[PDB]
């Protein structure tokens, strides 16, 4: 359409550069529902570009989530005060953005406690989880055994309430409200 919904290709390659190895597998997740299968961040993007989903805004979010105001100004000029002005207009679920925005508050010790935890209520997970895998991954692994999803975060919730991070435990139910709310009360009588 315009220059506010379709990014370039040469600069993407130059953007996908300042983003470390963490922000990559992390970014890939944020879009695992649209580019099913893809690996390299590029892999994912290559498929989004074509599908016509890889919009500029949608992109602005992916960045907005990896929390890089720096890259948000030095490339998009928009500050934190001008990026929140286009969220949701993407293919990024309220959910994905959470798990990420959570796999950030967890540290190496708590994160490895969760690993060795998942590997208990199901020993079929210690075959897709080495204690060097990011949170964002352990989430997807739980997603296959059917332990999480945008509709059943509990298993996880009190998995965190276990690690005593009520905050996350809460912040993961504060979602459980909103989502479990509108998406049933709004798409309700109308």
Curated annotation (Swiss-Prot):
It is found in: Host cytoplasm; Host nucleus. Residues 7-77, 94-174 form the DED domain. Signal peptide: none annotated. GO terms for cellular component: host cell cytoplasm; host cell nucleus. GO terms for biological process: negative regulation of apoptotic signaling pathway; positive regulation of necroptotic process; symbiont-mediated suppression of host apoptosis; symbiont-mediated suppression of host autophagy; symbiont-mediated suppression of host NF-kappaB cascade. Keywords: Apoptosis, Host cytoplasm, Host nucleus, Host-virus interaction, Inhibition of host apoptosis by viral FLIP-like protein, Inhibition of host autophagy by virus, Modulation of host cell apoptosis by virus, Repeat. Inhibits TNFRSF1A, TNFRSF6/FAS and TNFRSF12 induced apoptosis. Directs the degradation of host NFKBIB but not NFKBIA. Also suppresses host NF-kappa-B activation by interacting with and preventing ubiquitination of host NEMO/IKBKG, the NF-kappa-B essential modulator subunit of the IKK complex. Interferes with host CASP8/caspase-8 recruitment and activation at the death-inducing signaling complex (DISC). May lead to higher virus production and contribute to virus persistence and oncogenicity. Also participates in the inhibition of host autophagy by interacting with host SH3BP4. Associates with the death-inducing signaling complex (DISC) formed by TNFRSF6/FAS, FADD and CASP8. Interacts with FADD. Interacts with host TRAF2. Interacts with host NEMO/IKBKG (via N-terminus). Interacts with host SH3BP4; this interaction plays an important in the suppression of host autophagy. This is Viral CASP8 and FADD-like apoptosis regulator. The lineage of its organism: Viruses, Varidnaviria, Bamfordvirae, Nucleocytoviricota, Pokkesviricetes.
């Amino acid at each position: 359409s315009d220059s506010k919904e379709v990014p370039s290709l040469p600069f993407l390659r130059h953007l996908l550069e300042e983003l470390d190895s963490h922000e990559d597998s992390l970014l890939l997740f944020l879009c695992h529902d649209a580019a099913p299968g893809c690996t390299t961040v590029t892999q994912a993007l290559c498929s989004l570009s074509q599908q016509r989903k890889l919009t500029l805004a949608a992109l602005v979010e992916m960045l907005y989530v990896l929390q890089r105001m720096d890259l948000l100004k030095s490339r998009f000029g928009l500050s934190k005060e001008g990026a929140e002005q286009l969220l949701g207009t993407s293919f990024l679920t309220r959910y994905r953005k959470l798990m990420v925005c959570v796999g950030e508050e967890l540290d190496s010790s708590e994160l490895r406690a969760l690993r060795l935890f998942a590997c208990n209520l199901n020993p079929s997970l210690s075959t897709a989880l080495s204690e060097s895998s990011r949170f964002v991954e352990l989430v997807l692994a739980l997603e296959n055994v059917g332990l999480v999803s945008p509709s059943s975060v509990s298993v996880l919730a009190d998995m965190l309430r276990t690690l005593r991070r009520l905050d996350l435990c809460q912040q993961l139910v504060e979602y459980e409200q909103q989502e479990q709310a509108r998406y049933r009360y709004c798409y309700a009588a109308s």
